[PDB]
Design a protein around this ligand. Structure first.
Ligand SMILES: N[C@@H](CCC(=O)N[C@@H](CS)C(=O)NCC(=O)O)C(=O)O
Ligand SMILES: N[C@@H](CCC(=O)N[C@@H](CS)C(=O)NCC(=O)O)C(=O)O
Lengths: 221, 214
């Protein structure tokens, strides 16, 4: 079928999250650049796709969706039979299996994302935007992040992936921010020096979907 | 079906409202944090973060309010309000029309509104002084969100369109907090479409029951 469209810069964790999901589900797509320096993401035309004036925006042959995690859920259910058929769980496990995945998707959006994103902005983006890194913000959020990682470290010592024996959207949603911290800051050790998290990252970051996302991010931002 | 935690917690209230709309019988089990009951190995088995609410039924256990709500809507799809997560006829597209606003609630609406509610309605009762700088900083972020909602609700009766859904429900706990427990009710009542929306959803029997339980 014709390629669906994701709007925004690949360096954005939210945009990368959607791209990764489309790749896992083998859904042909094209990335439409949005000139944020010219405020294109705030234009009346863009607001019809994304009411909050933020990226990414998503559109396929049937509808438009906003919010990276809602977009991902849509892709997984609309194109369930494509690519990785178990991204949102094994059919055999039904709703109970989906819940085992959803709780960690929520952990990502509610506990992991806030502090990791704050850190990433201060350390990986600010330095290139003519802004000074706020060390107080970094320190405060690192403490919050470590608390979440302690929970994950314990969990991943009893589970290969967040949902157990198989990779799922639960693992995928955590990848964009983890990649940012591991590859673009000196905080990589928070992940790579913790036995279970290190194993998990080494495994998931090697998947072809993520390898392609990294390749797509090798564009000027 | 057991929900662990205090009804005053908006996260617990969110789950209760969902169970009520789905007409699923349940009991609320108190979690005494002053006794460190949220840090016991038993509670941690249900909630790895030592936070509330915790949820358990005869089939499994789930944590995080929005995940618990999605589970309830899928597992008990035929109970109570059968359209809480959309109509089968509208397919996955119909589900997405709801999901995007549930995400708006969790990512854009929740952070600033919860920060405000804490400083204004909880910090005091905890012997702490209200930090008006944090309140105002978060109010600015919330206003941006409410202005988007105000425009949307001018063309839609509910977040997903002409029918009430989980997208509306997830916004209720924090809205109730600000409207009834703080001096920030004006943020909603001054915006006609948001005011209409709130007056309508807060009148639903499920929410009236949650308020009674609180
Ligand atoms: N919570 C949304 C939004 C993500 C987000 O924060 N997008 C940023 C990427 S730079 C953005 O557009 N920022 C511009 C702004 O807020 O004006 C999601 O996960 O899709
Ligand atoms: N994001 C989770 C947890 C929400 C949350 O922060 N719950 C509070 C209710 S008081 C809590 O248990 N706080 C205790 C703590 O921070 O340890 C959800 O929606 O269930």
């Amino acid at each position: 079928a014709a390629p669906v469209t994701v709007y925004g810069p690949m360096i954005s964790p939210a945009v990368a999250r959607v791209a990764a999901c489309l790749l896992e589900k083998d859904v042909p797509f094209q990335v439409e650049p949005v000139d944020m320096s010219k405020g294109e993401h705030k234009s009346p035309s863009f607001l019809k796709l994304q009411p909050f004036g933020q990226v990414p925006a998503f559109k396929d042959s049937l509808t438009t969706v906003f919010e990276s995690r809602a977009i991902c859920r849509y892709i997984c259910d609309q194109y369930a039979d494509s690519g990785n058929k178990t991204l949102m769980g094994r059919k055999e496990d039904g709703v109970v299996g989906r819940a085992a995945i959803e709780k960690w998707i929520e952990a990502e959006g509610q506990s992991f994302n806030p502090p990791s994103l704050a850190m990433a902005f201060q350390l990986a983006f600010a330095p290139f935007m003519g802004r000074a890194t706020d060390m107080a913000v970094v320190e405060q959020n690192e403490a919050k992040l470590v608390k979440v990682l302690d929970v994950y470290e314990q969990w991943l010592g009893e589970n290969q992936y967040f949902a157990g024996d198989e990779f799922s959207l639960a693992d995928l949603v955590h990848m964009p921010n983890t990649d940012l911290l591991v590859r673009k800051t000196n905080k990589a050790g928070l992940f790579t020096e913790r036995k279970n998290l290190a194993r998990w990252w080494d495994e998931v970051s090697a998947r072809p979907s993520w390898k392609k996302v990294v390749e797509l991010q090798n564009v000027p931002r």
